[PDB]
Symmetry: C3
Subunit: 273 residues, 3 copies
């Protein structure tokens, strides 16, 4: 509603690490405060120009990785992006792999998820009196998934074109017994902590949201189990490739998502009672 500075708008939102913003590319960056009914987003939003497209960058963990997955104000974050006018949301996330062929350093563009979170407090924007039940059979925006996959291929990177993400509560990593359940029983492909309720909220806000996941580790299945320092190290080693993909895709998002390939773009038409 109120922004400071006033009158700022953007077309594409990027949620992820602070390292994705590059001041050498983004023209006329401005730090923006956006009012939300839920209080503070994770940090200031940075708005600037990439090849003529206005982009809003939000670090989900805050600058300096100050906010763990369970403590993020997911409602404020998605509200703020929607208030700025964005239509496309690219989420960039680190994930663990549950399969030998999805290797550290590969990208995955997932198509499904399983929510095993417990403690996120709000899974919706709609607490009444209008009851809203969005259909999430196909929860990601296909228009954007396909654009991410094409970019990655054109740049020569490995991009797995499907994947089921199991979202766990954390902040601790899985036990071996849990990981066996995710991999052998649920048949999930990748594991992370931040997708839910971010994706739920993006869908309710009628955004075209997709995830670009970067595999950082093999969970408990290698010689050494995952540690936080390994995730950060691998991520920082490869953020350059994620940046190159982002600066390739964003100019192609000057237009609107195609309704027939955006499951959430008109979610509220059929969802509200």
């Amino acid at each position: 509603e109120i922004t400071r500075p006033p009158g700022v708008r953007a077309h594409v939102g990027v949620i992820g690490g602070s390292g994705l913003y590059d001041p050498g590319i983004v023209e006329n960056p401005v730090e923006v405060k956006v009012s939300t009914p839920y209080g503070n987003p994770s940090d200031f939003i940075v708005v600037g120009d990439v090849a003529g497209v206005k982009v809003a960058f939000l670090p989900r963990h805050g600058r300096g990785h100050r906010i763990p997955p369970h403590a993020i104000n997911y409602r404020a974050n998605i509200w703020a992006l929607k208030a700025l006018g964005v239509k496309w949301v690219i989420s960039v996330s680190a994930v663990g792999s549950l399969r030998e062929d999805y290797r550290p350093g590969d990208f995955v563009v997932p198509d499904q998820f399983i929510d095993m979170t417990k403690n996120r407090r709000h899974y919706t924007f709609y607490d009444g009196p209008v009851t809203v039940h969005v259909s999430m059979a196909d929860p990601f925006c296909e228009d954007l998934r396909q654009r991410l996959i094409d970019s990655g291929r054109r740049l020569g990177y490995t991009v797995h074109e499907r994947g089921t993400y199991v979202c766990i509560e954390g902040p601790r990593f899985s036990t071996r017994a849990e990981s066996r359940v995710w991999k052998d029983v649920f048949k999930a492909d990748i594991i992370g902590m931040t997708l839910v309720p971010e994706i739920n909220l993006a869908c309710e806000a009628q955004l075209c949201y997709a995830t670009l996941a970067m595999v950082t580790d093999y969970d408990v299945w290698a010689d050494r189990p995952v540690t936080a320092e390994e995730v950060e190290r691998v991520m920082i080693s490869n953020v350059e490739r994620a940046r190159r993909m982002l600066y390739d895709v964003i100019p192609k998002l000057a237009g609107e998502p195609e309704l027939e390939r955006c499951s959430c773009c008109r979610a509220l038409d059929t969802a509200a009672i």
Copy 2:
């Protein structure tokens, strides 16, 4: 404790949609406010006579479907019914089907459930200093299940006599990956959002509770995934059949549940420490 008007009592409680109350049948309806230690129930309770049996009707979502499943004051709702003296609780619920033979428009009287909720805040009435752990191996009241099945058969409706209900958090519907887990891995039959913690609380209150579920949709498994508007439409089309069953069963509930076919009727004898 305090009611307004004072001195109101009832024998049978019905929890479900507002459309189930029929002013053409119910004699001498009175809207009742019932004090609870947990604040407001979903709405006023309507108490009236059906063929000489006193019935209390509570719309779980409130009149006008104002309260989504995660925001319902389950403790207040079950406390209020217990305070009015009810022994039998018929819950009427819309569910999705995970099996081709449980079709839209069929009734199901489930016998088991799996709780996959996350965000309901209170799963019990007993937070100490008396610790209570009720046994819920057979969580529904068999005496009432059998009466519902008999009514449905006598009226010529399809009533499936068993079923495992998976209760999910919502308000969003399942992904395809989640639905595959419910159906293929957990082997659940029907899916809904409101059973838990309603059933837990009913058991702790020593009520004979059973669910009459109406199948409204096939979840993600048809040509088109479930939407909220489809659920409401199918429900409203068939509420007439649910009403006919209710007005058939209620006169037969003039007596008491049989202890040997009411697993929760003496739950607290063995549950309290």
Copy 3:
């Protein structure tokens, strides 16, 4: 930080029932209040000497079993033990069995767990600005597990040397449909309510924690389902054997845990961002 009386320290913590403290063994017991940033622990901590080793005893449910599993202040409890200087934590817990060969009266020293809790509110000590993700692939302290198994064998008791614990929310016990999932789908061995988030927090605090579980019942799988009164009765019948094991093991804990057999002893080195 502040203790009353001041200057109290201990080396070994025991978490479990009040019946484990034996005033005939423990020399110079003192009831201690320990300040925590999270408010009150379950009860006073009792500190005393067992064969020259200083031991702190905390009843997790409080004296008189006043606090059910979902209402325990897990953060306060583990903070208080850490503030007293303890290095070893022996948790004693009642569990249900999901397998015929783990019989009522047997001990189990589990090696894995699966968290199916929902409502414990805090799963970590670290809410930012330092984000901490501890690795819990092998979540129990092996040094202590092996010492418990050896004690039990030397005293002639049955001690199962492995086991996956599924931790459920409660306070109600499982349905038959849920229990089938735990046993047949997840392949868990034992079931209980109190392990999580106690173990998470112990790991973050760099404690060597292990569970000595006592099987009290077969969940829903016997002729009669588990009840609370059966759990208490079986527990109290066998607490004498648990006491004998504790007074055998504690003198052997005069030293420090071996780092190579203590997965959490240096958890924070690699976990903090």
